[PDB]
């Protein structure tokens, strides 16, 4: 990739944070999967820039997709017609908070999702706010479709959640950003879609007529840290 | 135009014409104000995209095409529309009355604000927590768009996309439910099956409109300036568009007993009638753009 290599300081705290975060949750074998496919390490690629909290936080929801949340559409499409689908529900009404949450919610992945959503919210703007449990609503539904848009776009949300900033909403959705984060999400061919993402980085100062210093600041450390998802995403495929 | 699908209307046009009117009155918006109803016809193109809807449904999506005609869109006339600075200033501004802020600005507390409280407040109404995040959040990609379409931007079926998503039919389509009474449920709504079909029906409006008020990023003058056609030929290659994308809606259309192994009953007619009002609003907004 055309662009350096990054990764966090904290990868063997959050390490240690996770290992108990897994067991406050009631997910204490799966553990043995995490520290064979290093997501932690992933988790220090993906998010180099991020504050120590931040890193936890996202530690936690990549041990979060790969032991709990599988462990649920393991084996579906044979034998689940609308239970996946009341399985992804229900975690949506563990984000929304409905009257009966059901099972789902009391369940170690649906508390622990409550926890990861409670987490992430903190320091948000409604809009961000908004937004995520809308990508996050759209993950679930997708993946539930496939019983008969992967999880990048909530880590694409997680940029600036761990990195202490927040773009605008207005210029969130300007087009320029929107093909950049679809280019990135198809990364995670391949040299005409960086050719192609490389073009479309110079659009980024055609929105600066619309911003003030911070939100400038803001779309610059998020096209960073869209560089540092695809170069760490490499890295992690790479050494694996 | 020549659509497969029958041209349908609501009875109740003429109550909402008075009910409308009211609402204005009492939201501030009105003399030289009645020219919305008289040759614009708002009251009757309500009619035709929410034919489906009880008659405060229809009444609430009169209120808001008229918001949406004279005053957001008087806001941004003439040489208004093509200030990036403050296009973008009175989208946030807007878009800050859809969400809860301590400290307001003074747009947010202005007339077209406080009518679009009223508009939102009740388009909350009887609906969801999730309809109540997705439809906010097509509301601010709408006003995003719009943004970007203040300043010249400039393949065709990009720029197609572009004006789809920047047309005012992804709220609108959201109001199909909460008009009709019913809700399609979210694990439904996200499936690649609807989202096609809610694109289709998107980029078809937005043909429609920017064939119409071409008088740049309209559609028409994107496809002479960068295709090398004459203004017949540009029409002849929307219409050509428009006729793929209608091929395309029935093709994906006949995909939607794909989500019946997904949903109950009252789910499988929810999307039924979310299919039909999709119809609705191609047909109706086709009607309205030859009368009106």
């Known amino acids: 990739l055309p662009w ?7 990868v063997a705290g959050a390490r240690e944070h996770c290992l108990g975060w897994l067991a406050a949750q009631g997910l204490a074998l799966t553990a043995e999967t995490f520290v064979t496919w290093q997501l932690d ?20 929801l990549m041990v979060w997709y790969f032991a709990p949340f599988d462990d649920q559409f393991d084996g579906a499409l044979g034998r689940d017609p609308r239970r996946t689908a009341g399985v992804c529900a229900g975690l949506a009404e563990v984000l929304y908070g409905v009257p009966e949450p059901g099972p789902v919610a009391s369940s170690p992945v649906g508390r622990a999702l409550g926890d990861l959503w409670r987490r992430s919210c903190t320091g948000m703007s409604p809009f961000w706010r908004t937004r995520a449990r809308h990508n996050w609503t759209g993950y679930l539904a997708a993946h539930t479709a496939e019983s008969v848009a992967t999880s990048s776009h909530v880590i694409m949300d997680l940029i600036e959640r761990t990195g202490g900033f927040e773009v605008p909403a207005m210029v969130w959705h300007h087009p320029v ?7 990135t999400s198809e990364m995670i061919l391949t040299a005409e879609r960086v050719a192609r993402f490389l073009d479309v980085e110079r659009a980024v100062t055609d929105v600066d007529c619309l911003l003030d ?27 694996t």
């Open 177 to 183: 950003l929107v093909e950049l984060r679809t280019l």
């Open 41 to 60: 390490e992933l988790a220090g690629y993906f998010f180099p820039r991020a504050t120590q909290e931040g890193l936890e936080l996202a530690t936690d």
């Open 4 to 10: 350096p290599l990054r990764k966090h300081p904290g």
């Open 213 to 239: 210093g911070a939100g400038r600041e803001a779309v610059r450390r998020f096209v960073e840290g869209l560089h540092d998802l695809v170069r760490g995403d490499n890295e992690w495929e790479r050494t």
